[PDB]
Amino acid sequence: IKIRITLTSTKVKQLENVSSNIVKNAEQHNLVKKGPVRLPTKVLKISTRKTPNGEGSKTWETYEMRIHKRYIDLEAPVQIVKRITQITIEPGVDVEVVVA
Amino acid sequence: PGVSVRDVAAQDFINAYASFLQRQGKLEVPGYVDIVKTSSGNEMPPQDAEGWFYKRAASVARHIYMRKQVGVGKLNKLYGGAKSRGVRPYKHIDASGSINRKVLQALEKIGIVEISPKGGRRISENGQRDLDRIAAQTLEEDE
Amino acid sequence: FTPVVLATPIPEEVQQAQTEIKLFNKWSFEEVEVKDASLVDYVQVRQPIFVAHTAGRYANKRFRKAQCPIIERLTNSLMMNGRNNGKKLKAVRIIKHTLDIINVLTDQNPIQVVVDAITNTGPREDTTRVGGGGAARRQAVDVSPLRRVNQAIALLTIGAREAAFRNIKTIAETLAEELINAAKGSSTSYAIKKKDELERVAKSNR
Amino acid sequence: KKSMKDRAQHAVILDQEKYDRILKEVPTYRYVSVSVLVDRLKIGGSLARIALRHLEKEGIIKPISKHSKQAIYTRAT
Amino acid sequence: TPVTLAKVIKVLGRTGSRGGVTQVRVEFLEDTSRTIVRNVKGPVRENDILVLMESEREARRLR
Amino acid sequence: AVPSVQTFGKKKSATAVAHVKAGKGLIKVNGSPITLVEPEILRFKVYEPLLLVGLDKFSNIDIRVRVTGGGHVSQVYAIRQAIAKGLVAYHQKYVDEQSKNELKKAFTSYDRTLLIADSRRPEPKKFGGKGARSRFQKSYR
Amino acid sequence: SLVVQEQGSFQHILRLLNTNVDGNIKIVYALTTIKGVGRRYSNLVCKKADVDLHKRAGELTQEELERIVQIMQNPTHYKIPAWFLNRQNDITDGKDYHTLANNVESKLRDDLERLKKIRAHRGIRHFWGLRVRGQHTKTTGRRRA
Amino acid sequence: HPRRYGKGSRQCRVCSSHTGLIRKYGLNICRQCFREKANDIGFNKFR
RNA sequence: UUAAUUGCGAUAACGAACGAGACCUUAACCUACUAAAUAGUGGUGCUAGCAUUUGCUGGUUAUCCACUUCUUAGAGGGACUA
RNA sequence: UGACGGAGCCAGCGAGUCUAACCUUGGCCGAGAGGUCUUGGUAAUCUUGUGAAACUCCGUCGUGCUGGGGAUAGAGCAUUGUAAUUAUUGCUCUUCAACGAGGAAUUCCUAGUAAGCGCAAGUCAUCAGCUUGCGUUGAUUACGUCCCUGCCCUUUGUACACAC
DSSP: OEEEEEEEESOHHHHHHHHHHHHHHHHSSOOOBOOOOOOOOEEEEEEEESSSSSOSOOOEEEEEEEEEEEEEEEEOOTTHHHHSOSOOOOTTEEEEEEEO | OOOOGGGSOHHHHHHHHHHHHHHSSOOOOOSSTTSSOSBSSOOSOOSOTTOSSHHHHHHHHHHHHHSSSOOHHHHHHHTOEEEOOTTSOOEEEOBOHHHHHHHHHHHHTTTSOEEOTTSSEEOOSHHHHHHHHHHHHHTTSOO | OOOOOOSSOOOHHHHHHTTSSOOSSSOOSOSOOOSOTTSTTTSOOSSOOSSSOOOOOOSSSSSTTTTOOSHHHHHHHTSOSSTTOSOHHHHHHHHHHHHHHHHHSSOSOHHHHHHHHHHHHOOOEEEOOBOOSSSOBOOEEEOOHHHHHHHHHHHHHHHHHTTSTTSSSOHHHHHHHHHHHHHHOOSOSHHHHHHHHHHHHHHHTO | OOOOOOOOOOBSSOOHHHHSTHHHHSOSOSSEEHHHHHHHSOBOHHHHHHHHHHHHHTSSOOOSSEETTEEEEOOOO | OOOEEEEEEEEEEEESSSSOEEEEEEEESTTOSOEEEEEESSOOOSSEEEEESOOSOOOOOOO | OOOEEEEEEEOSSOEEEEEEEESSOOEEETTEETTOSSOSSTHHHHHGGGTSSOSGGGSSEEEEEEEESSOHHHHHHHHHHHHHHHHHHHHTTTSOHHHHHHHHHHHHTTOSTTTSOOOOOOOOOOTTSSSTTOOOOOOOO | OOOOOOOTTOOSEEEETTEEEEOSSBHHHHTTTSTTOOHHHHHHHHHHTTOOSSSBSSSOOHHHHHHHHHHHHSOGGGOOOSOSOSBOSOTTTOSOBOOOTTTHHHHHHHHHHHHHHHTOHHHHHHHHTSOOSOOOOSSSSOTTO | OOOOOOSSOOOOTTTOOOSOOOOSSSOOOOHHHHHTTOSSSSOOOOO
């Protein structure tokens, strides 16, 4: 049972609270694991013109998505698929539970 | 103490290996010899019309031992070049696929490299002992 | 001097040049004392370099350019005319071949020859611009030695550009022949001709 | 005015009537190179390279330092 | 070419309508302790060395 | 165990990780030795850190540098800082101080970028212009 | 390191295919002078005739030039993959032909004369001398008439 | 009704306009409603 | 005096506010902390060669072991003109 | 400081298919575009080390409206699509014109900046000579002024006040 927990959230202060929490829950008993990997921040580039029509200067803006993703890997027998699935979810945080 | 291609210069090595195939060993005959541009961005066949092939084999054999798993499609962009597309600015154009395919098929039966799984070709022992021994003799040819 | 051997033998020429004092391949940075006492503190000497390429922080403040060696001042001066921008390795190839040409003819140190050429071809006085009203007039005063050397390198640079332009002669020896002509004094090259042209212009409006 | 050019006539194929003088007129030259051969001996740049290589074969001059599209030379002194 | 060596100690300021000319105080090495005002193009400051073609002139300001 | 230290260098887009260990005294990059990194002029430029004190410091020390990214002159500018920093690390790990202080002062008193990384990074391009500090043609009447 | 004698066989003027040919230059690039043959096709014929490439046009014998130019009339018989010919899959014959230096303008005149009789869009403007490829001529090409 | 399209017959999701579309990003809307929506796409606005 | 009614100081003015400043992001450094086969590094195993005499170049996820300096941002430190 | 052809040939930003058909690796065929069989990926993992170009090394050329330049057209080979003719676009051969450093005037610029060069994205079923972002090489010249063109504060004048 190779349970892997993947986290995807935009608010950088929020998923860190989740990531620290699941580590604390996984720290209980023994439940050997690895620390939180830091993958590159996928910055999204949307570029639009401020003026609706053609009048005015060539003013440009870049609206950005800063999505941060950090997954964890856990290995243990069947108890942990029951003692970890407890969802510590908050608005703006998405979790993806994948086993094996 | 053991000399490889990395320990010798690139230009004199591929020239010595080219002269090696010029004199010893038959590489192959492409059929469309000195009538092709060897690419799409170029419009003039190589000046060394009688050659351009055994030194072609030397370059690709050296690089296929330099790199690990690459195919003819990769070879096209490896040896591409900017094309003067008329008034348009220079743009990269990949090399001719048939030329790179022909030299690769020419050298398969020679043994210089063997077909690798998961794509690309991996160097065989028969084809790298000679590819490495030539470097062990090319550095002493100056004296 | 004892040649030191390692796991990867290297040519003895670099070790010989690295034994006592660092220099170029065969050339020496010594015996290049300037004859003009007005150009000191502005030309960089006594600190030898191997290749003119250097990414120094010389354009940040006002006078950080004083410690800029002479040799790459020529290469930096050659870094214009449009399509010649970039590829500074060409800008360092030209000077190395230029001093190589000056090595065989006038067997003295080429870097001391170009220094002497800079002193000779450096204009000392120039005219300015005065409004006046309706018509423009020119007043002539002196020129700082910092502007003297900075203009001197340029005069050689754009004096050899057109000389080697639209001609069989390459720019390898065109710079070479221009610098010796300016150093010895021939009144035939572009640099000396422009130097006396501004001297007589300032003399007329003195 | 921009009159008609002189149509410079640098040599492209050597011949005996002009092959013989190179061994006798080039001497007494302190500084030699490929460039001076083109504009003074009226010979091609590529022709200068092979001719100087042939002339240096006789043990008179040596490349010293040479590279692409450039060379330096000096007569026997 | 009769030239004279000139020594600078003080600087007055940048003059000229374009601002490319600087008022600089300059002395003489030969027969020192003599003050003559002169103009200059290039950037200058204290403790530089300059050469003048002529020594007997005085320009107050330039446009 | 094995006495080994590792350092790294920087450039505009070039990083030069260097592996330094005590052995027969070998120098190589990407499997190719020092005299083949193909600047063909800046060959002396990369010689600079290891020549101004001689080869006595590299008698029995193997150093290997891996370079990735950056332009050709940027690539060449990466090894010199890696080997110089690796030279300092070896001086900081195996040899005494009297040799170390002389070595570092010879490095610093000559050139800065031997041990000082360049912080002059490219400026991002601005709207309304091709370059960072360039503007379009106005062309008014 | 090749030394070649240049006897009186050298000539400053050439005359091949009823057109003026200049000498004193490389034969490979001397064949490009004659119209209807480009830089690419020039080296194909030069190497197909098994002649030296760096020899000048003036120092050239009759047999070599005859061997070079006899390819042009019927190149397809001389083992060419037949993709360089300027006249391939012609409407009249359907075969691959290479019009020589004097049939190039005769061919396009025939091409233009059949476009004019058919009065196609691509032909009326060609007779008018205007653009037929769709290129804009409202603001470009003013100073040509 | 006899119709073919199938070659870019995409309109604005929120206003049904065949004007300039950004698209290929999951929004397939017009620029003006993209402007006067806020706090949904690229809201951060650090730069 | 400062890019800045930005500061000193003077002063029928005092108390103030907005803007600028302030604030945030990005590009910079960290061989200091958590670190990480969806990034790597070195070694131990299998295997290929060159001179074989000491080494070098490689490939290999179920061959593992140790680490985050090079690759990634988290809490942070770091220049304020000292 | 060049054109052309062969060798060394190094980056960053970003994007990418689910009830749809995107990026496409490897093998094979064809000079080329392109065609076939599969593989990997919903993505730091696979495209992609985007092995890009400007760049340097070997040669040919030669001061010649020439090997610079491809406007101008002709014919043939393919892709996108219900349909492409006033050639969508790509590829092959041939025709090879003006242009030889542009006169009043004018545009941007104080460092990785300008400039040279390329890459990703926007328009897109296909089509960049545009723009938005990124990357490579990477100068000389200023450290000053209000003289022109404009700005702020103070004083003075005004028969202006929709205001020189």
